[PDB]
Design a protein around this nucleic acid. Structure first.
Ligand code: K
Ligand code: MG
Ligand code: MG
Ligand code: MG
Ligand code: MG
Ligand code: NA
Ligand code: NA
Ligand code: NA
Ligand code: NA
Ligand code: NA
Ligand code: NA
Lengths: 96, 149, 221, 169, 178
RNA sequence: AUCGAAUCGCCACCUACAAGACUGGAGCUUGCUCCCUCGAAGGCGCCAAGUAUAUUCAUGAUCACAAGACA
RNA sequence: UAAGCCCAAUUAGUGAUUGCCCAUUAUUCCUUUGGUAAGGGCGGAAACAAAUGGAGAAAGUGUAGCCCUUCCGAUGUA
RNA sequence: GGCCAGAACCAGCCCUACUGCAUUAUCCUGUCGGGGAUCAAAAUCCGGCGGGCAACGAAGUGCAAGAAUCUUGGGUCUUGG
């Protein structure tokens, strides 16, 4: 396997033309750690402080004919403990 | 022909035109529908103010990548939109570090009063007023990639 | 299984309500064994919690005699030096389905064991599964679209009964009482169902006329 | 029902670029193919259709095998098969499916308030009927308890405790 | 589906020389996937029949012959194939198709399934459309009935690729996983 | 009681059953005709308890785990 | 109603001639290293203090390679 | 700020959209004769004769050079600003 690129299957995306709509969209993997660490708006929004963390990426291209996508995560690769877990595909950056 | 250095330069898509009702995709007011008022100079962020009495969105500047500009529009020509300048959103610099200033409160009141009148004057004004009160969500079974906006 | 007292006390401390995970219940009646197993195995690797019921009604292509012989050839494979710790030959139809799915998973990895542990299999539909929600089917693994009806097929329960499964009549009696109880409750509640259908008819006369026009345009009236 | 594949049978195309369109069988090639045509549709000239892609309808015009284009046009008009078909429930469902595919965010909202307005008035109508003759769980439960509770509250001890602890409020 | 073979008319001759100042021009009929295979089959016939090599000849035309309008017809295909065991086996078969190319493409799929014959071991001798009254086989003549009808039974109707699902509720159309 | 978490569709209308050589019902002519509820939707839910006369939303300042979640 | 065998396609009698997945391969981009390597510059252009544009510039096989541009090759037992 | 992230634009690359020229005839029509099968036809089919473009979303036939600027495609966390 080549861990630099991930495969994400989105609900109700079952064709290759379906997965082309999502190219360039932002992709996020939400998990939690053991300790509360720094976040965005650690000072501006202290309510955000939590063990929750997210890893961000972008959809690069579809994969196969059945609505799969290739996702590249920022800098690093997504952990293998994320396999079979929920991934968030956002509607931005918007082309509409 | 407009030079890139000029304040009039823009590469914004034609769907994000003034008067277009847009779905806010991110930020505090995500899911809300707002009315696109203008684009700030130098290819700046869009200024959306969905009537704050309808959905609670104030006069805020948003990026065009975080908005879905729909094909349903509202005539904004009556709304001045001139006093909404890039200096309206500038803040003083902080040294050794809800509340709304009078200038921002009066600008919001004057713009939204002319915006509400514009929506009323339009046919399907009642439907479009309740359209702006609705909230967009992604539900189970939804396929936004197949939709037309 | 049975919750610890620590788990029960923390629920009281947290004050949380009852929780049920997102579980898909599949009615495996008239489903091809290996096609349903392949579909379920992929879904388990995709993080799905799946319960399969009526595993006694799965189908295998071919005569019941040839499929019985295929199990008896499986049953004859055992570690000669120590039959214990050898292959374990399970006779229940749900155990046959679970073994089939297990062979379609990476069983010797922590990830393939997680997927297998998310599958629950039953004979019939037990009481804890009846009222949980609507059962689903796999259209691409259903017998009436997968076999030519001229060819013989076997029901997994009948084949398993003659290789060492002792609870065929228990499940048959339990399933008989289940449909008897479910049809009694379906005969009841028909007044409630007819009352809701007529309310949706009477609603069309009370609701705004322009909203009825929208309903007709999109085929809802 | 299962309608026979015959010369003159109206069919609906199941999948492909001609999906949801209606034509007439006109001719049968073998066990797998037919020669569908519909003069009143611009995209449905005479062509070969696989019999897996067609759905026979209840209408059958009176034509012969390998009929002329003029003969089918006259038969289709006189038989009124297309006018009859358009009034069916499955024909209105195909049109409604096309309206939903091209619907904008405003028409999706307008449908949402239409189905919520119908649901609201169904709830209002159900409440009126439910009050008259109990059919819901809470109204049937109340009617089973009303007699027993009346017996229990008919006693003097019940009446006194009610009076004492109502006056305290 | 449209036929995988095309109707080709290759016209050629041997290159004029001192021995043959005016060579004979030959017209050849072939059903091939493309014109490169069509020219290859043309020069195979020229070599084994007229003793003319592709290197000593030239091709005058290699155009495709236009199909007639699509009509349900009976096609007589005179075809031959080679096997090591039996040698050359020539058969005449009837097919129900709408075009000459479709009938020949059907005959190639027929010879492949029933006799394990590949394209380069098969030689088409003649294809023509015959009337209903010259059909010998009962399997073809059963489609000549003036009122021929049949129900579509045992049909596996797959959903539109956009609307196909994995898990569907048992007696509803609602998709649980899609 | 540490404990901050990942999860993001509810139902007391699906949550009964069976069949795909067919299960809306008839006729005889047995593949066509006729009747109906016309044989391609489980109900809701997606911001006014309902389609109207309306109402607080900001400064959380342009994305950031939804800064919140007993529907 | 193969997930078997033979043949045949690429979203299918619609309107043309690239379905998809995997390399230490191919194309291209970045960097290293070595050439039977190919070229340019190297006579300090002029001007310019701190408090408040910079530094370097070796006639050179090999160095922290005099500097810059360019092209090609790169695995390997004894 | 030499840190993290988002959008703008530049240049270069990498993808897609947008198509013309030639060709057709063993073809397209109409009409006579035959032939066919019907309750009667029509059609499939074979000949003579008269016209011809099956017509550019006609044909799955040969080659296509169409400035993503007009007419705001997409990507570059695969490049450097
Ligand atoms: K070098
Ligand atoms: Mg042993
Ligand atoms: Mg959170
Ligand atoms: Mg070496
Ligand atoms: Mg045409
Ligand atoms: Na087992
Ligand atoms: Na395995
Ligand atoms: Na058939
Ligand atoms: Na059949
Ligand atoms: Na030196
Ligand atoms: Na190099």
């Amino acid at each position: 396997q080549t861990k630099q690129t991930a495969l994400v299957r989105v609900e109700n995306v079952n064709t290759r033309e379906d997965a082309t709509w999502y190219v360039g969209k932002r992709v996020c993997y939400v998990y939690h750690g053991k300790k509360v660490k720094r976040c965005v708006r650690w000072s501006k929004a202290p309510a955000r402080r939590s063990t929750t963390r997210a890893l961000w990426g972008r959809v690069t291209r579809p994969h196969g004919n059945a609505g799969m996508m290739r996702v590249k995560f920022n800098g690093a690769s997504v952990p293998a403990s994320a396999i079979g877990r929920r991934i968030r595909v956002y509607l931005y950056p918007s082309q509409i | 022909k407009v030079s890139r250095k000029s304040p009039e330069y823009t590469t914004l898509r034609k769907s994000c035109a003034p008067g277009a009702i847009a779905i806010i995709l991110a930020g505090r007011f995500r899911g809300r529908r707002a009315v696109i008022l203008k684009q700030l100079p130098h290819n700046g962020p869009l200024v959306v103010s969905g009537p704050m009495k309808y959905n609670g969105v104030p006069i805020r500047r948003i990026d065009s990548r975080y908005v879905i500009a729909t094909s349903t529009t509202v005539d904004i020509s009556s709304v001045d939109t001139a006093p909404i300048t890039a200096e309206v959103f500038q803040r003083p610099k902080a040294e050794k570090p809800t509340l709304v200033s009078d200038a921002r409160a009066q600008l919001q009141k004057k713009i939204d009063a002319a915006l509400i009148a514009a929506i009323k004057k339009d046919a399907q004004g009642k439907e479009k007023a309740g359209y702006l009160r609705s909230v967009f969500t992604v539900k189970p079974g939804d396929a936004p990639h197949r939709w037309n906006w | 299984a049975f919750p610890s007292r620590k788990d029960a006390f923390r629920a009281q401390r947290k004050g949380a309500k009852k929780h049920r995970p997102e579980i898909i219940v599949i009615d495996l009646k008239d489903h091809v064994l290996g096609r349903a197993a392949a579909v379920v195995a992929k879904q388990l690797l995709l993080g799905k919690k799946i319960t399969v019921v009526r595993c006694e009604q799965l189908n295998i292509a071919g005569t019941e005699i040839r499929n019985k012989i295929k199990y008896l050839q499986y049953l004859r494979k055992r570690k000669l030096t120590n039959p214990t710790k050898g292959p374990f030959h399970h006779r229940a139809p749900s155990d046959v389905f679970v073994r089939t799915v297990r062979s379609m998973l990476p069983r010797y990895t922590k990830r393939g064991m997680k997927a297998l542990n998310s599958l629950v299999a039953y004979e019939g539909i037990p009481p804890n599964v009846v009222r949980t929600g609507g059962r689903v089917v796999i259209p691409r693994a259903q017998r009436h679209v997968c076999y030519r009806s001229e060819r013989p097929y076997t029901v997994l329960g009948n084949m398993c009964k003659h290789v060492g499964w002792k609870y065929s009549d228990v499940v048959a009696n339990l399933e008989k009482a289940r449909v008897e109880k479910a049809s009694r409750h379906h005969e009841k509640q028909a007044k409630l169902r007819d009352a809701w259908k007529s309310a949706r008819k009477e609603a069309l006369a009370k609701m705004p006329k322009h909203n009825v026009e929208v309903l007709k345009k999109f085929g809802y009236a | 029902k299962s309608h026979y594949i015959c010369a003159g049978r109206l069919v609906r195309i199941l999948r492909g670029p001609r999906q949801d369109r209606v034509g007439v069988i006109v001719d049968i090639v073998d066990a797998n193919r037919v020669l569908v045509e519909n003069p009143e549709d611009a995209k449905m000239w005479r062509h070969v259709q696989n019999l897996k892609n067609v759905e026979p309808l209840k209408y059958c015009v009176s034509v012969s095998r390998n009929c002329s284009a003029k003969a089918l046009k006259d038969a289709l008009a006189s038989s009124k098969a297309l006018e009859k078909y358009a009034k069916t429930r499955t024909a209105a469902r195909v049109e409604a499916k096309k309206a939903c595919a091209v619907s904008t965010d405003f028409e999706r909202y307008q449908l949402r308030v239409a189905r919520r307005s119908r649901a609201h008035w169904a709830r209002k109508v159900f409440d009126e009927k439910d009050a008259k003759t109990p059919v819901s769980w809470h109204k049937v439960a109340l009617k089973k308890m009303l007699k027993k509770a009346a017996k229990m509250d008919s006693t003097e001890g019940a009446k006194r405790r009610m009076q004492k602890a109502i006056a305290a409020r | 589906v449209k036929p995988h073979l095309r109707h080709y008319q290759v016209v050629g001759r041997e290159s004029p020389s001192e021995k043959n100042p005016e060579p004979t021009v030959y017209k050849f009929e072939v059903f091939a996937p493309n014109f490169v295979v069509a020219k290859s089959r043309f020069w195979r016939m020229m070599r084994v029949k007229n003793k003319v090599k592709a290197t000593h000849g030239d091709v005058l035309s290699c155009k495709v012959v236009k199909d007639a309008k699509l009509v349900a017809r009976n096609y007589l295909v005179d075809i031959a194939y080679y096997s090591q065991r039996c040698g050359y086996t020539r058969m005449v078969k009837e097919f129900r198709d709408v075009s000459k190319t479709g009938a020949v493409s059907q005959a190639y799929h027929d010879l492949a399934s029933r006799h394990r014959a590949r394209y380069h071991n098969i030689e088409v001798l003649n294809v023509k459309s015959i009337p209903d009254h010259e059909v010998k086989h009962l399997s073809i003549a059963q489609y000549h009935a003036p009122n021929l009808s049949f129900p579509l039974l045992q049909r596996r109707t797959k959903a539109t690729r956009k609307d196909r699902a994995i898990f569907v509720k048992k007696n509803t159309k609602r998709a649980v996983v899609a």
